């Protein structure tokens, strides 16, 4: 069945409008937290950075306040001296009675360009799936959710084996053009629109193509994407 | 504004060999035969245009010879931007099991369809797969583009001199074509070190789908879509 390209896709959860012109403010610095563990046990795994957040607490506050809000989602890979934004979306005109990112408007759906065919958001748009990342994708990933000025942080400690994966692709996450120093964030000099590419397919279609491309390359699709576990406190 | 759901039917059903690794890229620097390369002119006079790099070749005469020889054949298509000290490959496809009774690239097999990752959403092949369309390129995309068609060991060259207004296009994206990571010196080519699989990304949509999405995305950004694409005029 791997031959047949898909032609029907899950219907989107909400019909938004993409404001192609919207110039977001400079990125708030990611250098300051809930820590999740993601470790691959084999080469060429499809891994999932998924983690629930007590955010519906915040949206109930906004919903009772009868206030529609703007928000923002950004994924960073954190290096020892810099941080690379790899996925970024701005949201506006959100009804707080709905789920996050079910908003009337949004910026371009922005990605590090070489990630387009190797990554996608999960169904609730808050998680990130990586198809066969290389060993160099090991490290620390930080999800920053911005909702009405407040910021929720989630860290993912990701382990990829060093055995070569024949379908992996080197992402050079630490290249200085995309790996921004703490100063560049502080001076307000980091604008995702300038160096991240757009890919405005809805998540349902992006994910559908990611799975089809991965299996077509010979990957083994997991039965189920699982929430990344919190770091395990020791057992006496 | 409403997303496309019907696409032109493909010219030919082909199989993509995702594992295939082409041999190193032949140097595009043809210092010896600089004088006789078919050179075309392509100029935009307003910002944010969609331009086409189209040029007929004598490829059909080569295909007739192979057809008379009943010779199933291999072939390669590669586009470069030629800078003064290096050359950036920006699109690359290898073709195998080619039936010489058909048109170029109507082949039973091919490699991944490779692009500079940041071009995916801003470029696409034309219907015969030999031309190249750029949607809202920036001023820095001005310059010399060289198309290298390799067929049964033979190589056909077409050069395009492209001019883009200096005024900033608001929907354009900087491609950093001159970056050493992707712009390769003549020595790197001669030493057999340039492997497109290493550093170009894939976009395995058939041309008809890629071209359809390209047009829809351009128009959605407020681009003016030209009535039709024309062959570039020769240097006169
Ligand atoms: C998003 O938009 C689509 C298309 O406008 C909606 O699907 C249509 O919904 C209307 C009203 O119920 C039906 O009459 C049509 O038959 C549906 N299909 C089409 C092709 O128009 C879809 O329900 C919308 N979803 C949300 C969450 O607003
Ligand atoms: C096949 O193409 C790959 C690029 O996708 C080349 O990979 C690198 O080649 C160099 C030199 O041979 C090695 O030092 C690297 O370790 C290779 N990378 C990986 C990820 O293995 C490869 O050289 C090509 N195959 C050849 C030339 O036989
Ligand atoms: C491609 O294959 C489908 C069947 O999967 C067929 O119906 C279609 O006609 C084929 N296209 C061409 C151009 O042969
Ligand atoms: Mg692939
Ligand atoms: Mg756009």
Author numbering:
A (entry chain A): 39 to 70, 77 to 280
B (entry chain B): 41 to 276
Give the text the authors published on this PDB structure.
Equine herpesvirus type 1 (EHV-1) and EHV-4 gDs interact with equine major histocompatibility complex I (MHC-I) to initiate entry into equine cells. Of these, gD is the (main) receptor-binding protein that interacts with the cell receptors and triggers the subsequent fusion process with cell membrane and/or uptake by endocytosis. The structures of gD1 and gD4 revealed the existence of a common V-set immunoglobulin-like (IgV-like) core comparable to those of other gD homologs. The cores consist of a nine-stranded (A′, B, C, C′, C″, D, E, F, and G) β-barrel, arranged in a typical V-like Ig fold, flanked by N- and C-terminal extensions with loops, α-helices (α1, α2, α3’, and α3), and small β-strands (str2-4).
